[PDB]
């Protein structure tokens, strides 16, 4: 049934373009949100949606949104979760912060 699918997920183009600009994996995103890789595919297929506190955290999850390698106009305040920034600021003693997709 195609009425039980979704495109108004709050998870479309706007975020999608940009999470990919950061290269961070499905499994890595899922930690940034306390969920599974398997749920995040479920949103990207229209089968499931995030909740309101989660929708609240997606806005905040990247500090950003919007952009492809090509998208030039993007004027909006950078807006990131504090655990997203400030508890993120590690591995601190190494360069660039030593992430899993690096």
Domain ranges across the chain: 1-102
CATH for 1-102, among 2.40.30.30, 1.10.1240.10, 1.10.260.40, 1.10.3720.10?
A: 1.10.260.40
Residue 66: count other Cβ atoms within 10 Å of its Cβ: 16
Structure tokens at 13: 């183009």
Using CB atoms within 10 A of its CB, is residue 23 exposed (0-12), middle (13-18) or buried (19+)? exposed
- Method used to determine the 3D structure: NMR
Residue 32 contacts residue 56 (beta carbons within 8 Å): no
What separation in angstroms does the CA of 41 have from each of 4, 12, 20, 27?
A: 16, 12, 14, 10
Query: Breaks in the chain at C–N > 2.5 Å: after which residues?
Result: none
């Amino acid at each position: 049934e195609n009425a039980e699918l979704e495109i108004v997920t709050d998870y479309y183009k706007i975020i999608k373009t940009a999470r990919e600009q950061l290269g961070i994996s499905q499994q890595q995103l899922a930690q940034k949100l306390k969920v599974s890789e398997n749920i995040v595919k479920r949103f990207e297929s229209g089968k499931l949606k995030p909740t309101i506190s989660q929708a609240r955290q997606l806005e905040k999850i990247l500090g950003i949104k919007l952009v492809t390698p090509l998208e030039n106009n993007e004027e909006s305040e950078k807006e990131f979760d504090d655990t997203g920034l400030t508890l993120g600021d590690v591995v601190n003693i190494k360069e660039g912060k030593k992430l899993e997709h690096h």
